[PDB]
């Protein structure tokens, strides 16, 4: 934000706007600014759009560093302590709506994290320890799955009676589902098999298929029953909109 005529204003993917420069600057490469959270902070870049960082200071003895990506679509709005090494915020938004905001502890170690997917679905971790473990939950449209986290993966659990469903997401985005029932009678014990190819879990009881639980790309879950003998799917897959519908499929 330098001038109306000079210092062009470009639309920044992250609900922000950085104003470049017209011709150029005094000693070096282009310059630019942008007002962030009622406390505009200026900085100087190299190119003519927003491909550069924006330094600054806080309203309460701290710092701020808007490290705008080189492609104009990945605001990395940092907010260091006051020295410029210890952090207290790090909400990295993106063009397609992606967004991963973090909060740290009294030593720059990440404490909390909240990943928001393009489609709005969220994945929030809290109480993150040094090892990488912590409380976790996923916000889907209509309900919320709770679970835990480890440097290895995230595990959302849904319990219904003696059956316990587990949705794992590798710290790489890979989804896989498991199902266990402590019941020992073949007549009633529920068991399942995950098909990574079709991304679906097929529940079986006493050798018979009962239902297909599909974990879609759009972060949703659908349920379809088989015919009475378990020889083929029947009807139409139905979208799960409530936590209870899930606990229902597990009965």
């Amino acid at each position, epitope marked *: 934000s330098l001038d109306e005529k000079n210092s062009v204003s470009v639309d920044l993917p992250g609900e922000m706007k950085v104003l470049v420069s017209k011709e150029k600057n005094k000693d070096g490469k282009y310059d630019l600014i942008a007002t962030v959270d009622k406390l505009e902070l200026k900085g100087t870049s190299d190119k003519n759009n927003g491909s550069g960082v924006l330094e600054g200071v806080k309203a309460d003895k701290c710092k701020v560093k808007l490290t705008i990506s080189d492609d104009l679509g990945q605001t990395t709005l940092e907010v260091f302590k006051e020295d410029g090494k210890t952090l207290v915020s790090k909400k990295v938004t993106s063009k397609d709506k992606s967004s991963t905001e973090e909060k740290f502890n009294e030593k720059g170690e990440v404490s909390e994290k909240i990943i928001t997917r393009a489609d709005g679905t969220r994945l929030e971790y809290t109480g993150i320890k040094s090892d990488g473990s912590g409380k976790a939950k996923e916000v889907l449209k209509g309900y919320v799955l709770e679970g835990t986290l480890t440097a290895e993966k995230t595990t959302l659990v849904v319990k219904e009676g003696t059956v316990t469903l587990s949705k794992n997401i590798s710290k790489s985005g890979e989804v896989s589902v498991e199902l266990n029932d402590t019941d*020992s*009678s*073949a*007549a009633t*014990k529920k*068991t399942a*098999a995950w098909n990574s190819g079709t991304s679906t879990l097929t529940i*079986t009881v*006493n*050798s*018979k298929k009962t239902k297909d639980l599909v974990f879609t790309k759009e972060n949703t879950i659908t349920v379809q029953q088989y*015919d*009475s*003998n*378990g*020889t083929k799917l029947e009807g139409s897959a139905v979208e799960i909109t409530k936590l209870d519908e899930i606990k229902n499929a597990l009965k």
Partner: antibody
Amino acid sequence: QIQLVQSGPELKKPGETVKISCKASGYTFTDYSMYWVKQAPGKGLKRMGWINTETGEPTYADDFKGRFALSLDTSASTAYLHISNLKNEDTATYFCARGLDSWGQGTSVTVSS
Amino acid sequence: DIQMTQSPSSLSATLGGKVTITCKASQDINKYIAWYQHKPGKGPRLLIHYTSTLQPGNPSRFSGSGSGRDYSFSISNLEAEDIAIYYCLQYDNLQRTFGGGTKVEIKR
């Protein structure tokens, strides 16, 4: 409780037909397929085929095409195994099964003159 | 259909000992194997389902394990009355198939 009881021991002459019955009680006949298994001396247990109890469609195993038939009487929760043109290779014991936890007591068939 | 090659086809063990029968499928069967005990003149009795779950009504001397295409079943602390023919069964498919069976005899 749940039980599959079958018809008694049969003694037939070569070329005849035998119809084995399997009555289901204690569960909803229509919720499980119903399998048939052949137990020949020297052989272990071999699946002959199974039948969809909801629709009656029978699906046979390769070694049992032709002379064999699977039918049902839903009104009586009973399945049937038909074997026509009996040959000595048919003298053995036959079982019906449902799910993983039910087997009839089996029925011995002797093909002799 | 999926083949189940079970082995050995016959065992002769001493009382109190442990016996292991294995079953190899021609393809992944996702843990859907069951093991039955077949004593003469009676119907096959379910012992283990879903590769390792003990069906209620049976002593824990019976157990199973495995995954993919490879499974095993055991009888530990072999009792005098355990003689019988044991069978694996895959039911991952509608065309369920049986292993050849294993005759368990007592060595005394």
